[PDB]
Amino acid sequence: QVQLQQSGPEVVRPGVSVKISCKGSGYTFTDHAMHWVKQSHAKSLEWIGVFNTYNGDTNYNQKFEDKATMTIDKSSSTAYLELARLTSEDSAIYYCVRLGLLGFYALDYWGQGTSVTVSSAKTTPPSVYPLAPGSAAQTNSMVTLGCLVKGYFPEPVTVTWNSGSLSSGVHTFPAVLQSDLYTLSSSVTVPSSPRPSETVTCNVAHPASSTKVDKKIV
């Protein structure tokens, strides 16, 4: 069975080289070449370059001629990607792809993909802040409660409510970037009748800093 395994995510400083490893299995490596496609948001799916896995002649895209080079270790049946002088906008997801049936197809199977982010800031624990309806917000049977997160790096953060007990109405949001630090928030919808034995507590878990915080809501 054809399957491509790829490295994990990285976070690196600008101007340093990073390595991406793509190991293939289930097929004879020398038969099929390997591609490399970059996925980001400013650009969408631009093509990096191909590695003719038999001989070794490379066909790089003209835009990534200088900042990317590709190597093959045929002994371990692995394809390598090397990047240099990474810029701030270089944060993207790099896919390794097998080329199948030269003459037909273009790109058969795609690896799970590694996302390399650069930034400049160091790792920083998140700060969890509470949001509650005001003293004049009890005019409706339903109100919106949520907590928000500032000043953390890098992604991701998993947020739960009462240790995941309240999984209905929970809404998180994709992280946003500002002042070199990421940002995200969460919200839930609850009735505006808080019982004395009923409480809402949102917990933020961050494995990059190994810090978990619970915030007092209502």
The residues that touch another protein, with contacts defined as CB under 8 A, are 30-31, 33, 37, 44-47, 50, 52, 54-55, 57, 59, 61-63, 95, 99, 102-113, 127, 129-137, 143-144, 146, 148, 150, 171-174, 176, 178, 183-185, 187, 189
Q: How far is the CB of 17 from another protein (least distance, A)?
A: 23
> Count of CB atoms within 10 A of residue 16's CB?
11
| 18: CB partners within 8 A, 6+ apart | 10, 12, 83, 86, 116
Scanning the structure block, which residue is given the tokens 């906008």? 89
Nearer to another protein, 113 or 154 (CB): 113
Residue pair 217/188 in contact by the 8 Å Cβ criterion: no
Nearer to another protein, 16 or 137 (CB): 137
Residue pair 201/191 in contact by the 8 Å Cβ criterion: no
Nearer to another protein, 150 or 212 (CB): 150
Nearer to another protein, 15 or 56 (CB): 56
Q: How far is the CB of 122 from another protein (least distance, A)?
A: 19
Q: What is the DSSP string of 164-206?
A: TT--SS-EE---EEETTEEEEEEEEEEES---TT---EEEEEE
Nearer to another protein, 139 or 197 (CB): 139
| d(C-alpha 130, C-alpha 37), whole Å | 41
Q: How far is the CB of 73 from another protein (least distance, A)?
A: 16
Scanning the structure block, which residue is given the tokens 């003293």? 135
| d(C-alpha 112, C-alpha 41), whole Å | 18
Instruction: Collapse the DSSP code of 158 into the 3-class scheme (helix H, G, I; strand E, B; otherwise coil) and give the result.
Output: strand
Q: How far is the CB of 58 from another protein (least distance, A)?
A: 9
Nearer to another protein, 17 or 25 (CB): 25
Q: How far is the CB of 13 from another protein (least distance, A)?
A: 25
User: Which phi and psi (to 5°) does residue 111 adopt?
Assistant: -75, 170
